[PDB]
Predict the 3D structure of the following.
Amino acid sequence: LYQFQFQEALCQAAKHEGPLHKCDISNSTEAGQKLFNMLRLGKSEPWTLALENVVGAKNMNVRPLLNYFEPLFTWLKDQNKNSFVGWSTDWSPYADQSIK
Amino acid sequence: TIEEQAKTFLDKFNHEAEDLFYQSSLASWNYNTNITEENVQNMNNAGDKWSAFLKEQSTLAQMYPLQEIQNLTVKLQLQALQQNGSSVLSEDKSKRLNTILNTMSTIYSTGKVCNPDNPQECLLLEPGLNEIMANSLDYNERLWAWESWRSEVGKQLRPLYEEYVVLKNEMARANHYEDYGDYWRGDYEVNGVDGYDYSRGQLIEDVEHTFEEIKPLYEHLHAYVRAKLMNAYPSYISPIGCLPAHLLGDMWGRFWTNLYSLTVPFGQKPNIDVTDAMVDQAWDAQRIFKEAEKFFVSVGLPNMTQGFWENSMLTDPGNVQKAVCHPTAWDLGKGDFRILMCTKVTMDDFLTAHHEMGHIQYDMAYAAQPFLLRNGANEGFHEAVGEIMSLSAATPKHLKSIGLLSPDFQEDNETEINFLLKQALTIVGTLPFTYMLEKWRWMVFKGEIP
Amino acid sequence: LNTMSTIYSTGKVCNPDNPQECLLLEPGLNEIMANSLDYNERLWAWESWR
Ligand SMILES: *[C@@H]1O[C@H](CO)[C@@H](O[C@@H]2O[C@H](CO)[C@@H](O)[C@H](O)[C@H]2NC(C)=O)[C@H](O)[C@H]1NC(C)=O
Ligand SMILES: *[C@@H]1O[C@H](CO)[C@@H](O[C@@H]2O[C@H](CO)[C@@H](O)[C@H](O)[C@H]2NC(C)=O)[C@H](O)[C@H]1NC(C)=O
Ligand SMILES: *[C@@H]1O[C@H](CO)[C@@H](O[C@@H]2O[C@H](CO)[C@@H](O)[C@H](O)[C@H]2NC(C)=O)[C@H](O)[C@H]1NC(C)=O
Ligand SMILES: *[C@@H]1O[C@H](CO)[C@@H](O[C@@H]2O[C@H](CO)[C@@H](O)[C@H](O)[C@H]2NC(C)=O)[C@H](O)[C@H]1NC(C)=O
Ligand SMILES: *[C@@H]1O[C@H](CO)[C@@H](O[C@@H]2O[C@H](CO)[C@@H](O)[C@H](O)[C@H]2NC(C)=O)[C@H](O)[C@H]1NC(C)=O
Ligand SMILES: *[C@@H]1O[C@H](CO)[C@@H](O)[C@H](O)[C@H]1NC(C)=O
Ligand SMILES: [Zn+2]
């Protein structure tokens, strides 16, 4: 989870435009300091404060992870139209040759 | 008072901790980069001479009462020493705990299964069963491997795990924890900062709450993979059921990566690989590291230090000097950072270079902290910076700039889907397995499951 | 013929209490049977080979 929060808070500081999965941090010193002043803390601070010093929040978030996979999500919702999305927990591979 | 005394004690501690740590790490490095029976015992001598100093200094510090200090960077270090660990256990119990741990580890390492038709060819797990489970495409062979591992080896570990939970629960309750799971969750706890607190009970709610937004995407992934496996194994997979557990790429289903060949969305368009363009431009395992360092220095972080270039093992030694080179970074102390890895000129090493150098760049940043306050903010922070450094360096907009991937290369919106699906098979495919496993273990370290 | 010969050469038996240490015939079972003086150990070797 952190792996994506970090990134979504970084190229949002490198002024990215396109989808998340294309952002590159290179050549953006203003996105270096924003990361550097979290690295030089070690364990001398609560991890909540350290996360605050980059993301701007205090908790695990799943929204950046979902924003990373948005194109794939739409393409899948398209490819899964003629199918059953979900599963049933009663079928089993050996249930048709069992005797009760 | 009590404060000045504690501060002086930590001061006196740091010197010896630093020096002994340096020498022990030097021993372990010299052993790792040079596998010689000479160095084994030497590394063991250094290791024990560090372990003993740690135990002694820990008991010598059990006297300072905790809830009297107000300096946070002092309470933080003291809390790391007073941690009793497994000492509080009785003597004979601690010895049986160690015996159990070593037995389980060596059963896993040396267990082996063998054919029903030729009982004189047995396979270990690492080379031989992992290979079947990763490569094969035969239903019955996969089922045989999957079942034999769990029947020949998993049945030996039942009686041992039963005793392991009891002893660990004792060790945990003798340190004012509810159970062992509550002891493990104690890495995310924050205490007394007025706005940033965090309790060991909140972690459960946070992961159960984050795992709700993932099910909508994980079940579309699941449905797509099932509809694609219903073509490689016809008649074996119900179109509305679950997926049989032995057809998931590896032995436990932890990662879904090895399903790529079966489920690639646009099978004719190729991936982005620059191995060729690297050999053609004459790249050895020394230019890739200057490239990584240049990438890092672009963003603002500092350079590398000479000792890194001198002492490092960037390349495989090749000759009789053997050295296990699972890629790693090392922070020996006092200013000696160095990586050890046998770089082959491919792409999947151009990435591990960035990963490991990100580890290093983390370490060089907090190197001005007290010896016990040199780690990630918690346990999940360290690999999560290696990951983002490795993730930003594999994008065509970067490769196009560093020289590879000749400029007239248009990325189609189909290779983008190819890449995102290769990514989601290891990131998203593994979140439910992780969640389910830790949930089960938290519940059995509570007697919640008889 | 080759199957029988190689079964004899590479067959191995292993302990009932530690199934991860198997012994071949030439070094390891011949040694037990030639040196040991324990009734139960000899019986175990004799029976497991056959
Ligand atoms: C690997 O370790 C061996 C010993 O464990 C090293 O051998 C020593 O090498 C130095 C210099 O080459 C000699 O002065 C010693 O006499 C050697 N000792 C022995 C027992 O042979 C060897 O040098 C190490 N490899 C490298 C590359 O440093
Ligand atoms: C906690 O104690 C440390 C001492 O280890 C204090 O840090 C010192 O602060 C003074 C004040 O300027 C500096 O001159 C020293 O160089 C600092 N020492 C170190 C090792 O950094 C710290 O101030 C104390 N905490 C609080 C909140 O006062
Ligand atoms: C660590 O373990 C010891 C006992 O193994 C705990 O008990 C203290 O031990 C010291 C040893 O000299 C005594 O002086 C104290 O009186 C003991 N305290 C109590 C309440 O019995 C010690 O509390 C443990 N520390 C932690 C942090 O759990
Ligand atoms: C970061 O910026 C520098 C300069 O702003 C880029 O370096 C130039 O790159 C172009 C094409 O790659 C070359 O034609 C120039 O000669 C380069 N100039 C220098 C001084 O190196 C660099 O490519 C940028 N990095 C990325 C990843 O785009
Ligand atoms: C990649 O882009 C192409 C070009 O837009 C997409 O192809 C078009 O998709 C739209 C969406 O329904 C159709 O209306 C057009 O008829 C398509 N054009 C052609 C020539 O077939 C394509 O769909 C995109 N890739 C994916 C995976 O959607
Ligand atoms: C970093 O090292 C390169 C050579 O490897 C050098 O050209 C550059 O000046 C160094 N950085 C700084 C800030 O001096
Ligand atoms: Zn790593």
